[PDB]
Design a protein around this ligand. Structure first.
Ligand SMILES: Nc1ncnc2c1ncn2[C@@H]1O[C@H](COP(=O)(O)OP(=O)(O)O)[C@@H](O)[C@H]1O
Ligand SMILES: Nc1ncnc2c1ncn2[C@@H]1O[C@H](COP(=O)(O)OP(=O)(O)O)[C@@H](O)[C@H]1O
Length: 719
């Protein structure tokens, strides 16, 4: 894919409340020309190369101007009012990030605190990052009540992994530079901690289960295994318990586990810290933790185990040490009075041998908070926090795709805006609605820090698809959001949905937008990846997926590229591997049919390549055809995507829509992208997209839809 880029003028961001937060201000036309949305990271290049998060510039900022704070100008090697190269950058989740600082901060600030303070932010080697933008007895009490422990010291990034540009994730490890010979070496990492029975917990079990109903099921599993083993023995069930908890990053998976195990003794390892250890020290750490949990019993908990036991991509299989690490865990699970719980944002990022009867026999998927749940979280985050008229309902309504981690960061930022307002007024800081709303202009949700992340796309980002949205809302959202009314009205349990249409028309895009609603756990796979890329049995991956969905209800099961997952008999010959998968799939689909809190949806560009047994009643029987965007639809798509692109008077998006027959939704989005770029390159100071700019763009952006293939898809439901 061609790497788009623009030279802009770099002006110093004069707003202190907008500076030193890892945010660069760009005109929307730049975002359009570069092919990115707000909150996407950009590469910034002067004499040096750095990266920052693209935030939309306020009014009064011409398209040819980028606003950079003092540290960004320094990191990019750009003088004020000088030229800067801006371009989209690939930002992977960091395995590790090594930072350097004073001997005092190196000894006083834990790696967990570092990760919390820098969560979601982009890092590049050589960069100067700030843990806190600003810095009295009432203000310090405020900072601590909101959870600000660290200070405002500027650090430097001495290393990242993988190389290039990375973002700090919950499964990342952020550790000090080890290390300057003069200064003392920093404390050891990757070793287990023990929390005794009935220990003081920051977040209670009651607090957790109001937005995470899955905590009730986890608690019930633990109690049966550890407290009432004769009940399970009477039924012939297994007394052992291994659980893999998954769900969006920072949604609160680890906090839920600690809350549920509050009355138990917990032996806890930090997956990333241990995973970063030298291979032999890594094994010893796991071994020490297993012997400790089996010495007295209780819960062995590994937060973010995907950093410790990565799934591997065949080019690199799992390391040999993983076999021995798994043997230790397996030994723990078989121990009476011992239970094993591990977390991971994406389950398939963990070694396949962990998702097995011998270690983790069952799984639990958490969900994004809906608007109601978000308001519950904000009120919880603001206990003992001096405030006025916060209007939390409005803040909750304006944070879709957010998680508690983000909301916490929103509140911390709000405390800074209050403390800044306080210092000028000399009054004691008191949070108002302005602070929280102002925080939203600088805080990037974790769901936007890396698509394919649940919450990155919302229905507003989807132009048009009125009829498709309508059908999906009624077929998927309505039954899940109203279980009892549907049952008492004698409405059938949610029918399986097959979503199909020509490429670049949003059949996948709209599902991802739909899946960001909240109060609904999403369990999604791409047909190709599960079959070809994943190390492990594909047939067991199917049963695993559905079992996690059943246990995490209300659940949506998204089988994208369903044609690859279940092709027609004869298309594949792999010693019966495909057969077992399809037969297992049919079996799972039939188990989902009577359920009311689980919906299954398959998507494909080629429905005729699916085994017809998938399309029988009780299975994927609701056929939703996604039409290519007509004249009406193209108007919406253009207007949605081109909303903030300044246009010249001789540009009419409506008449343009009528002329774009054969252009898919993606084609239209690309025509605006190309148009904006054509205008930016033509004249920076005369940025307004002209009719000629669009005319030139149409030379490179061609129609992609085949009228015969489109006809073939439309007739599919009747044939
Ligand atoms: N009820 C709560 N009150 C305050 N902070 C919370 C609460 N729940 C979660 N957090 C914070 O949000 C972040 C995300 O929680 P965590 O469980 O670590 O996410 P993950 O799902 O990635 O494990 C954590 O840093 C935690 O400190
Ligand atoms: N209605 C729409 N509005 C805006 N962008 C869209 C729309 N439909 C599709 N796209 C663009 O197309 C991309 C994916 O297209 P989609 O049709 O979902 O996949 P497929 O090619 O598998 O059908 C998305 O990243 C999105 O940018």
């Amino acid at each position: 894919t061609p790497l788009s880029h623009l030279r802009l003028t770099a002006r110093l961001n004069t707003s202190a409340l907008d500076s030193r937060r890892g945010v660069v201000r760009l005109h929307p036309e730049v975002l359009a020309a570069l092919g990115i949305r707000e909150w996407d990271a950009v590469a910034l290049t002067g004499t040096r190369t750095t990266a920052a998060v693209a935030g939309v510039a306020g009014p009064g900022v011409p398209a040819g101007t980028a606003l950079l704070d003092d540290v960004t100008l320094s990191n990019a090697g750009v003088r004020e009012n000088a030229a800067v190269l801006v371009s989209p950058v690939t930002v992977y989740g960091a395995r590790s990030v090594t930072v350097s600082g004073s001997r005092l901060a190196t000894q006083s600030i834990s790696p967990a605190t570092l990760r919390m303070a820098l969560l979601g932010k982009v890092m590049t080697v050589g960069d100067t990052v700030s843990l806190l933008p600003r810095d009295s007895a009432a203000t310090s009490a405020l900072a601590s009540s909101v959870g600000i422990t660290w200070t405002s010291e500027l650090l430097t990034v001495t290393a990242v992994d993988p190389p290039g540009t990375v973002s700090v994730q919950p499964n990342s490890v952020v550790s000090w530079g080890t290390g300057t010979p003069e200064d003392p070496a920093p404390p050891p990492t990757g070793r287990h901690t023990v929390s005794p029975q009935r220990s003081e917990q920051p977040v209670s079990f009651d607090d957790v289960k109001v937005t995470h109903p899955q905590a009730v099921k986890l608690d019930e599993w633990l109690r049966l295994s550890l407290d009432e083993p004769e009940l399970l023995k009477t039924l012939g069930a297994t007394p052992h318990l291994g659980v893999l908890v998954s769900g969006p990053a920072g949604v609160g998976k680890a906090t839920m586990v600690r809350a549920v195990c509050a009355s138990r003794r917990v032996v806890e390892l930090d997956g990333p810290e241990v995973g970063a250890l030298q291979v032999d020290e890594r094994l010893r750490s796991v071994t020490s933790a297993v012997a400790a949990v089996t010495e007295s019993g209780g819960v062995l908990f590994i937060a973010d185990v995907d950093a410790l036991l990565p799934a591997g991509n065949e080019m690199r299989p799992p390391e040999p040490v993983a076999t021995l690490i798994l043997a230790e865990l397996r030994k723990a699970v078989a121990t009476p009075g011992v239970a094993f719980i591990a977390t991971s944002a994406v389950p398939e990022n963990v070694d396949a041998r962990l998702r097995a009867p011998e270690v983790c026999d069952r799984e639990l998927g958490l969900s994004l908070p809906d608007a109601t749940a978000r308001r519950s979280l904000l009120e919880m985050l603001l206990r003992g926090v001096p405030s006025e008229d916060l209007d939390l309902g409005d803040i909750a309504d304006h944070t879709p795709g957010f998680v508690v981690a983000d909301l916490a960061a929103v509140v911390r930022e709000g405390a800074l805006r209050a403390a800044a307002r306080a210092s000028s007024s000399d009054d004691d800081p008191v949070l108002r609605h302005a602070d929280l709303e102002g925080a939203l202009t600088v805080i990037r949700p974790l769901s936007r820090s890396a698509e394919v992340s649940v919450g990155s796309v919302t229905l507003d980002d989807v132009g048009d698809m009125v009829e498709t949205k309508r059908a999906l809302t009624e077929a998927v959202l309505w039954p899940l959001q109203h279980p009892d009314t549907f049952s008492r009205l004698g409405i059938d349990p949610p029918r399986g949905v097959l979503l199909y249409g020509p490429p670049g028309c949003g059949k996948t895009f709209v599902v991802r937008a739909l899946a960001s609603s909240g109060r609904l756990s999403v369990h999604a796979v791409k047909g190709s990846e599960l079959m070809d890329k994943w190390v492990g049995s594909s047939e067991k991956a199917v049963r695993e997926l559905f079992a996690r969905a059943r246990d995490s209800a209300p659940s949506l099961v998204f089988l994208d590229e369903i044609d690859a997952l279940a092709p027609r008999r004869g298309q594949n010959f792999d010693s019966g591997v495909t057969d077992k998968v399809v037969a297992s799939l049919l079996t799972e689909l039939d188990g989902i049919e009577p359920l009311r809190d689980v919906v299954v949806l398959g998507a494909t560009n080629r429905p005729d390549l699916i085994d017809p047994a998938l399309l029988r009643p009780g299975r994927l029987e609701r056929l939703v055809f996604v039409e290519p965007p007509d004249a009406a639809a193209r108007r919406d798509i253009l207007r949605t995507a081109g909303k903030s692109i300044p246009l010249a008077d001789d540009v009419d998006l409506d008449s343009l829509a009528d002329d774009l027959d054969g252009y898919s939704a993606a084609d239209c989005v690309a025509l605006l992208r190309e148009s904006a770029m054509t205008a930016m390159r033509r004249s920076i100071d005369a940025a307004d997209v002209t009719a000629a700019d669009v005319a030139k763009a149409r030379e490179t952006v061609r129609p992609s839809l085949d009228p015969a293939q489109v006809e073939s898809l439309r007739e599919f439901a009747e044939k």
